């Protein structure tokens, strides 16, 4: 199957060309909305933290995959292990608000406290890159914030960006995979 | 905002995606 390569028009041959028989697939697992729909730890440093998805680790499935797109939209779900009252505030709110309790404040019920929050930016969509503040989902504050996780719901992605693996030392990257106990 | 090792809120934040919190 010769093509004019310069064209940039997609080409996909099949085993049929030599006599094989292309089968079926179920790429459920490689579905955007689906893969990103899970929790990811985000490194919190203070007892108050602005919610931002770019803070997921760049090599973590979610963050790696989110960064594999340039523009994105989604709602949020959060799981915080905290102490005292947890207060959330919407994108663009004066930071001073975090102290006020009439804002969505959740009392303690350990271990974690789970919430569903609406996309709250003022743009039609947000970005992974940018060639020039508002790119957030609001902020959270609790007397103590031991741990923080976020989950992207309803995810939409636009324009793909690259996504690299590990550069192997030798011919392939060998390593220890889950195996049964030797006995 | 150019590339950059800085922080959003800092006088250099207008160059940070790098860390102007990526995106304004």
């Amino acid at each position, epitope marked *: 199957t010769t093509t004019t390569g310069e064209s940039a028009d997609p080409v996909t041959t099949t085993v049929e060309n030599y006599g094989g028989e292309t089968q079926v697939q179920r790429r459920h697992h490689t579905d955007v909305a689906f893969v990103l729909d899970r929790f990811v730890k985000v490194t919190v440093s203070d007892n108050q933290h602005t919610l931002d998805v770019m803070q997921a680790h760049k090599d973590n499935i979610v963050g790696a995959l989110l960064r594999a797109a340039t523009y994105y939209f989604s709602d949020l779900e959060i799981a915080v292990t905290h102490t005292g009252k947890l207060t959330w505030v919407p994108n663009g709110a004066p930071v001073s608000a975090l102290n006020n309790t009439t804002n969505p404040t959740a009392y303690h019920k350990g271990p974690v406290t789970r919430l569903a929050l609406p996309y709250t930016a003022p743009h039609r969509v947000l970005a992974t890159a940018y060639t020039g503040t508002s790119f957030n989902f609001g902020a959270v504050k609790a007397e103590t914030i031991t741990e923080l996780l976020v989950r992207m719901k309803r995810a939409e992605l636009y324009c793909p960006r690259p996504i690299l693996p590990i550069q192997p030392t030798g011919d392939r990257h060998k390593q220890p995979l889950v195996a049964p106990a030797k006995q | 905002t150019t590339a950059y090792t800085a922080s959003a809120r800092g006088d*250099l934040a207008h160059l940070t995606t790098t860390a102007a919190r990526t995106l304004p």
Partner: antibody
Amino acid sequence: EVMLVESGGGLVKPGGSLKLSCTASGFIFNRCAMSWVRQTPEKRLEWVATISSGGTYTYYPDSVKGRFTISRDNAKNTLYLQMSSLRSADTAMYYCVRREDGGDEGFAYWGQGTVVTVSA
Amino acid sequence: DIVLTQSPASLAVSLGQRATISCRASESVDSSGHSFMHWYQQKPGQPPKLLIYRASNLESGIPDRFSGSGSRTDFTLTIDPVEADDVATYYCQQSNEVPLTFGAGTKLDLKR
């Protein structure tokens, strides 16, 4: 080589005005962010203002907002700090600092100074 | 405003000894994966001289007798060994967050 010589110091009465210049040499000025820091009599150092990258996004501490203006002239490589309503607290030795290079890395390369003496 | 508090404010130290200088910020000075803490040397009549610039890394070629460490709030200059070409007032300063605060200095002098 890199070179920041400031000019414009003086004795001024309260409420008065001066404009300093930081004349620059030995680097591409038009593509670097610039600062003024002062040093008070009792030898403590206050930042004064920062102008962005050969264009403008200007930044100030509270004591000086309203009274002091940082401006730059990329055409003839001179930074300015116009100062109105000189409060006697403003008697300091003023330095032109190159603020930015690849990153945020301190204030390396500091000018030499001009003193302002606000006194009646 | 973040406030920095240097300790001691003047120390006398014998030549070849070790002088350490702590600088506490009232609230974190790290942003991103960077402490934005800077250390300067002011000899009488000199402009300040940048010495250390993100808490640990030295500038240009100032002597390796000079080092810094510190994360968040607690930062230290270490001069080990002190030579007489070090008498001066030392300052730490932060660049994480406007208004770019500056510590009080510590005047190092020589125990003779």
